[PDB]
Amino acid sequence: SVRLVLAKGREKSLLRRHPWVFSGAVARMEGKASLGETIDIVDHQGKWLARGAYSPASQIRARVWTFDPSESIDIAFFSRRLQQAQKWRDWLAQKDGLDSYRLIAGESDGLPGITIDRFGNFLVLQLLSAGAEYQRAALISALQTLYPECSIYDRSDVAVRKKEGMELTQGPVTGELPPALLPIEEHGMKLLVDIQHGHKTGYYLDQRDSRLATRRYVENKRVLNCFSYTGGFAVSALMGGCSQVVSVDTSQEALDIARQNVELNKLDLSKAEFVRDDVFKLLRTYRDRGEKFDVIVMDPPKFVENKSQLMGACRGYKDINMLAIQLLNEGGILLTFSCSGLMTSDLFQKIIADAAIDAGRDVQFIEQFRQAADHPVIATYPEGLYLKGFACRVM
Amino acid sequence: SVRLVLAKGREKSLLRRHPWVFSGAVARMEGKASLGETIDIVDHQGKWLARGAYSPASQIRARVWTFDPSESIDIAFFSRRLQQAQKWRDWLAQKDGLDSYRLIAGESDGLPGITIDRFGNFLVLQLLSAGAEYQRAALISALQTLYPECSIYDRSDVAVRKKEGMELTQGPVTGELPPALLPIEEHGMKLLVDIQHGHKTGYYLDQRDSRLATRRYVENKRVLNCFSYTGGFAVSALMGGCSQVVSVDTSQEALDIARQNVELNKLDLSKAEFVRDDVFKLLRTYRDRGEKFDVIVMDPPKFVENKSQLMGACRGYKDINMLAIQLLNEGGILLTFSCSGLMTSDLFQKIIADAAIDAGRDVQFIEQFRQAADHPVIATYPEGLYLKGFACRVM
């Protein structure tokens, strides 16, 4: 019904099949549409370009559902998209021994604003854009048809929804309520996730390969895992045969789950330590007395200057990575990460390089990490790559 | 005791410990030094900053040997550098099942302009810069001392030398002459290398992880290996249990070695096809008749449009990757690479994305490749990262 007319020239992004239409590229709206309503997007002359979801409260005024002129956005549309995404995850599950994975990664699976993670028999939703919420009913119907035995839970309690003009929301959608802790599997390893209250959708599936890579580096080595959360990296270190792994986190609850994870995998508790403390404080205490480690995993949360898209300068990263380098033996390996929207892979690299200079030690980049394969990045949406990380060796 | 004086406020690079000192930064040469000779680098006030090698014919007027005031560059200097580098490769070889690897990766192992590859009991040199050649005797002494039972061969037939004011050179140094083909091991796989007349030093050790990843995607799938050369990818595909692997190359010699690698590993020859033909032609032939593959490996030769870092701007990568995408079905995977300093990782990504649009299909980036860990990149030398690659899934 309603159409969004692009300003002359401003249709280049659509021709590149980019899923987003910024408010600034819109010349006018022909007709009135509701929040999240399906609209057609045409060029300044009126030629059809795509069919998307209208988002009046957002700067991303519309997101593209499809570039096929004959494709309506209804239950069938979502069913087809789910089936296409499932084909990929079926292969990944078999190959990597997975019982859980991200099923739809928004724009990269052709469903902008929608994220769905599979955890055992639970499907966890995060409807982050206006279009996602508007199509909630259709999406659910498709999900119930394709995954009749699965329970659906909503974890749309993400601040980004405010950018789309919607309230945050979460809770059961269908089926049974998830347990406090649900065991999932990855690469012959079991991990407990909290769907109702855990981070994101319940866990960080995106760090799957970083965790697996940890196994290769830790044989008979002393490991320090900073901001360990529920200990995914700790279990991975033990699976790799580390002599000892020290997990540090500010949350006792997370550390308790970490210990439950070690026990669940029948690993050696004697080789694992769980320290509840201000990470920065612990790191300085260790450094001041000369503590040394062979492998250090560094994966901090909101860089500190979070949300500070403006006044970023969140060089809490330099301090954290500098401390890490100072705690490494010669030949020590640092696996450090960042998912902050205030920095790119290149800028993250410069920070590490700078931390090395101040620490008085040179480091070699020997590996670059990426979000797992169930978090694909469609080529038309490079911004989709958010997880940055490197494996560094102290010379 | 000749010194290279830097223009005021132009020593910031040395302060970041970057190994290169460009001509534009040189204020004046206080003294007369021969090509490759050891010299001191100072600021406008005469303060010592580093000790490097002079290269009058290059844009890179000097490369830093050391930033340690008391460190002289002699046999002991190279001996210590070789031992420090060997420490890392000993760990990598045992971990990844290697009897061959890059021992010294120039700047990244504190020896700018020097590259040394180890193939079994052979050490292959490549002295690319003025300083590398000038220090040949000292480097050789350290080597014969640390590796008394290894033969040394020189493969300094690299165009880079001309840009440093030298002529190309290659041939034996000490020990026995390498055999026509020498079998090496990596990840439980055997490959044949030609040290005397093969590409580079005799093989592409840097693609080790690319070959490994090829194994993950090919079980029960039809594979197309473009620019197979002496094999490597064809064997990897078979090691992964591919249903069929077709290798294309214009060189009958390379194809003969590819097949030899297959037999050497006792793999099913009945699943391997070797086609001698123009890769571009065969690709259009397959495209024209609707041939389809499940996985395609695309590792083009030397840029094709090299003729300088900037002489690139050639859409040969674009055209070649477009053909590949047209040869895949939904779910098909493209493993495509670039080693030319003719483009960054982001530029290569752009090309694939463009190839995708012209092909009329979307592709998902699910994995990113880089030179193997024995080809480290010191944080002070970002330009050290030259190998780029992506695993792309056709939607």
Report the C-alpha gap between A218 and B12 in whole angstroms: 37
CA distance between the termini of chain A: 63
Q: Which of A180, A212, A247 is the last residue of a domain?
A: A180
Please report the number of interchain residue pairs, chain A to chain B, with beta-carbon separation below 8 angstroms: 90
Here the tokens at position B292 are 């389809």
| B 96-125 residues with CB < 8 A to A | 108, 110
Report the C-alpha gap between A76 and B128 in whole angstroms: 61
Cα atoms found within 13 Å of the Cα of residue A313, Cβ hemisphere only:
1
- Per the annotation, the verdict on B150 as an active-site residue is no
Q: Would you say A99 and A120 are in contact if contact means Cβ atoms under 8 Å apart?
A: yes
The neighbouring-strand residues paired with A274 are A247
Report the C-alpha gap between A203 and A258 in whole angstroms: 13
Q: Would you say A261 and A333 are in contact if contact means Cβ atoms under 8 Å apart?
A: no
Q: Would you say A333 and A367 are in contact if contact means Cβ atoms under 8 Å apart?
A: no
| SS3 state of residue A140 | helix
**CATH code where residue A362 lies:** 3.40.50.150
For A126-150, letters b (16+ CB in 10 Å) and e give bbbbbbbbbbbebbbebbbeebeeb
Instruction: Let me know how many helices (H) and strands (E) chain A has, helices first.
Output: 11, 21
Q: Would you say A295 and A242 are in contact if contact means Cβ atoms under 8 Å apart?
A: yes
- Identify the CA nearest to B212 among candidates B116, B95, B90: B95
Q: Does B92 touch chain A (CB under 8 A)?
A: no
- Identify the CA nearest to B76 among candidates B63, B91, B62, B65: B65
By C-alpha distance, the chain A residue nearest B216 is A95
Judgement on whether residues A196 and A340 belong to the same structural domain of the protein: yes
By C-alpha distance, the chain B residue nearest A215 is B95
Report the C-alpha gap between B52 and B127 in whole angstroms: 15
Structural domain range at position B143: 72-180
Q: Does B319 touch chain A (CB under 8 A)?
A: no
Residue partners of B12: CB distance under 8 A and separation at least 6: none
Report the C-alpha gap between B158 and B35 in whole angstroms: 18
- Residue A215 Cα distances to A92, A204, A233, A270, A389, angstroms: 19, 17, 9, 18, 16
| SS3 state of residue A383 | helix
Here the tokens at position B393 are 């899934």
Report the C-alpha gap between B58 and B162 in whole angstroms: 9
Q: Does B127 touch chain A (CB under 8 A)?
A: no
- Residue A106 Cα distances to A85, A204, B241, angstroms: 11, 16, 33
Q: Would you say A288 and A326 are in contact if contact means Cβ atoms under 8 Å apart?
A: no
CA angle at A195 for the pair A194 and A199, rounded to the nearest 5° = 75
Judgement on whether residues B259 and B369 belong to the same structural domain of the protein: yes
By C-alpha distance, the chain A residue nearest B217 is A95
Report the C-alpha gap between A200 and B87 in whole angstroms: 41
Residue partners of A56: CB distance under 8 A and separation at least 6: A33, A35, A130, A165
Judgement on whether residues B228 and B367 belong to the same structural domain of the protein: yes
Q: Does A331 touch chain B (CB under 8 A)?
A: yes
Judgement on whether residues A166 and A309 belong to the same structural domain of the protein: no
* Helix or strand holding residue A77 (H, E): helix A75-96
Q: Does B309 touch chain A (CB under 8 A)?
A: no
Active-site hit among B226, B242, B339, B392:
B339
Here the tokens at position A77 are 């549309």
Q: Would you say B238 and B246 are in contact if contact means Cβ atoms under 8 Å apart?
A: no
Judgement on whether residues B133 and B35 belong to the same structural domain of the protein: no
| Dihedral sign, Cα of residue A307, residue A309, residue A310, residue A312 | positive
Cβ neighbours, 10 Å, residue A44? 14
Which residues in chain B have Cβ-Cβ distances shorter than 8 Å to A392? Answer: 379
Q: Which of B180, B200, B232 is the last residue of a domain?
A: B180
Position A107: which residue type? Answer: E
Q: Would you say A342 and A315 are in contact if contact means Cβ atoms under 8 Å apart?
A: no
- Tally of residues, chain A: 395
| Min distance B339 CA to chain A CA atoms (Å) | 17
Here the tokens at position A200 are 């994101």
Q: Which of B33, B51, B71 is the last residue of a domain?
A: B71
- Tally of residues, chain B: 395
Residue partners of A220: CB distance under 8 A and separation at least 6: A241, A242, A243
Which of A95, A357, A368 comes nearest B216 by C-beta? A95
Q: Would you say A142 and A79 are in contact if contact means Cβ atoms under 8 Å apart?
A: yes
Segments in B97-243 forming alpha helices (H): 130-134, 136-146, 160-163, 208-217, 233-239
Judgement on whether residues B241 and B346 belong to the same structural domain of the protein: yes
Q: Does A385 touch chain B (CB under 8 A)?
A: yes
Position B76: which residue type? Answer: A
State the structure-solving technique. Answer: X-ray
> Strands B60-66 and B20-22, how do they pair?
antiparallel
By C-alpha distance, the chain B residue nearest A17 is B357
Which of A349, A366, A380 comes nearest B376 by C-beta? A366
Judgement on whether residues A227 and A356 belong to the same structural domain of the protein: yes
Judgement on whether residues A278 and A342 belong to the same structural domain of the protein: yes
Cβ neighbours, 10 Å, residue A220? 10
Here the tokens at position B155 are 């493969």
Which residues in chain B have Cβ-Cβ distances shorter than 8 Å to A368? Answer: 368, 370
Question: Which value in Å is the resolution of this experimental model?
Answer: 2.0
Report the C-alpha gap between A188 and A198 in whole angstroms: 22
Q: Does A197 touch chain B (CB under 8 A)?
A: no
Judgement on whether residues A188 and A165 belong to the same structural domain of the protein: no
Residue partners of B72: CB distance under 8 A and separation at least 6: none
CB contact under 8 A, B368 and A365: no
Question: What radius of gyration do chain B's Cα atoms show?
Answer: 23
- Identify the CA nearest to A369 among candidates A328, A395, A333: A333
Judgement on whether residues A201 and A292 belong to the same structural domain of the protein: yes
- Residue B214 Cα distances to A115, B101, B162, B234, B334, angstroms: 29, 19, 36, 9, 10
Q: Does B243 touch chain A (CB under 8 A)?
A: no
E strand segments, A34-99: 38-42, 48-54, 62-66
User: For the residues of A89-135, what is the DSSP string, one character each?
Assistant: HHHHHHHHT-SEEEEEEGGGGT-TTEEEEEETTEEEEEE-SHHHHHT
Q: Would you say B367 and A370 are in contact if contact means Cβ atoms under 8 Å apart?
A: yes
Report the C-alpha gap between A252 and A270 in whole angstroms: 19
Here the tokens at position B172 are 């034996």
Judgement on whether residues A82 and A146 belong to the same structural domain of the protein: yes
Judgement on whether residues B198 and B339 belong to the same structural domain of the protein: yes
CB contact under 8 A, A382 and B17: no
Probe site for chain A from B86, B206, B361, B365 (most A CB atoms < 10 A): B365
**CATH code where residue A175 lies:** 3.30.750.80
**CATH code where residue B47 lies:** 2.30.130.10
State how many domains chain B has: 3
Residue partners of A238: CB distance under 8 A and separation at least 6: A245, A262, A265, A267, A268, A271, A272
Report the C-alpha gap between B367 and A372 in whole angstroms: 8
Residue partners of A90: CB distance under 8 A and separation at least 6: none
How many angstroms from the chain centroid is the CA of residue B104? 12
